[PDB]
Amino acid sequence: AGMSLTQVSGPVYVVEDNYYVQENSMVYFGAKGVTVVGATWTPDTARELHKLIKRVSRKPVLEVINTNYHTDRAGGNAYWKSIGAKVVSTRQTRDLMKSDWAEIVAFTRKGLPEYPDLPLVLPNVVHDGDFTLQEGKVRAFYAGPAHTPDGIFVYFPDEQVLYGNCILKEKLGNLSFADVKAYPQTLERLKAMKLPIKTVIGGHDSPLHGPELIDHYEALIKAAPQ
Numbered sequence: 001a002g003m004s005l006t007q008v009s010g011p012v013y014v015v016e017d018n019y020y021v022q023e024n025s026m027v028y029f030g031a032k033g034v035t036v037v038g039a040t041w042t043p044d045t046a047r048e049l050h051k052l053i054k055r056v057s058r059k060p061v062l063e064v065i066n067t068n069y070h071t072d073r074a075g076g077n078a079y080w081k082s083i084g085a086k087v088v089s090t091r092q093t094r095d096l097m098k099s100d101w102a103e104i105v106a107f108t109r110k111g112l113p114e115y116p117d118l119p120l121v122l123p124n125v126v127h128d129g130d131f132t133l134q135e136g137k138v139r140a141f142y143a144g145p146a147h148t149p150d151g152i153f154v155y156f157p158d159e160q161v162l163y164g165n166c167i168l169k170e171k172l173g174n175l176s177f178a179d180v181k182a183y184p185q186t187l188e189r190l191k192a193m194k195l196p197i198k199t200v201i202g203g204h205d206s207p208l209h210g211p212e213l214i215d216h217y218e219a220l221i222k223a224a225p226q
């Protein structure tokens with residue numbers, strides 16, 4: 001299908017968004033409602049995700065996290081705002097989005113001319129640092145720069161699932177905006193946290209991996225050109 005929504009563990013679901021270049025996002029079905037992690041590529045892809053969500057739960061979409069300022073994590077924002085869902089990010093992500101959205105949209109349209117010329121839609125819930133949602137069961141944190149300067153990890157402690165964002169994935173991928181030397185230092189900062197991890201969800205390629213995805217990408221980025 002164009003998009004799928006699939007249970008990984010308990011209330012934790014993976015979204016495979018096969019629009020444009022495949023990106024994987026997540027959904028958490030909570031007591032009061034639904035948290036989306038990654039806004040998806042466009043307002044259209046966001047509507048498609050919302051349609052899948054409504055087939056699983058009647059509860060409201062409470063909030064959507066922009067895990068970085070890029071089009072694949074924030075492109076859906078217009079749609080999420082339109083249904084009254086909070087759009088959530090760190091201050092850094094919001095500031096970079098304000099300054100650099102036009103440029104990341106232009107860069108996206110270079111490789112994907114079919115991609116829409118989306119206007120800026122900023123987060124309206126902006127956090128000073130690390131933060132949690134869903135009674136502490138969804139935990140967003142910064143461990144340094146990697147694919148972008150601002151990209152955060154999202155950890156689900158009950159299910160021991162780590163969302164890898166654009167930071168962790170199977171293929172080395174486009175290193176254009178990447179801090180290549182800092183990248184492994186961020187992954188080692190993550191390792192030093194010693195989070196219990198059974199599952200890592202890569203933000204591109206095939207989503208479902210074990211904790212080895214971290215080591216897999218670390219080895220790839222340490223061999224990169226640059």
Ligand SMILES: [Cl-]
Pocket residue numbers: 005006007
């Ligand atoms: Cl399922």
Ligand SMILES: [Cl-]
Pocket residue numbers: 106109
């Ligand atoms: Cl353009």
Ligand SMILES: [Cl-]
Pocket residue numbers: 067068147148150151152165166167
């Ligand atoms: Cl990222």
Ligand SMILES: [Cl-]
Pocket residue numbers: none
């Ligand atoms: Cl593998």
Ligand SMILES: [Cl-]
Pocket residue numbers: 208209210212213
């Ligand atoms: Cl694996």
Ligand SMILES: [Cl-]
Pocket residue numbers: 209210212213214216
């Ligand atoms: Cl792996």
Ligand SMILES: [Zn+2]
Pocket residue numbers: 070071072147148166
């Ligand atoms: Zn990106």
Ligand SMILES: [Zn+2]
Pocket residue numbers: 023070072165166203204
């Ligand atoms: Zn990405």
Ligand SMILES: [Zn+2]
Pocket residue numbers: 208209210212213
């Ligand atoms: Zn793997």
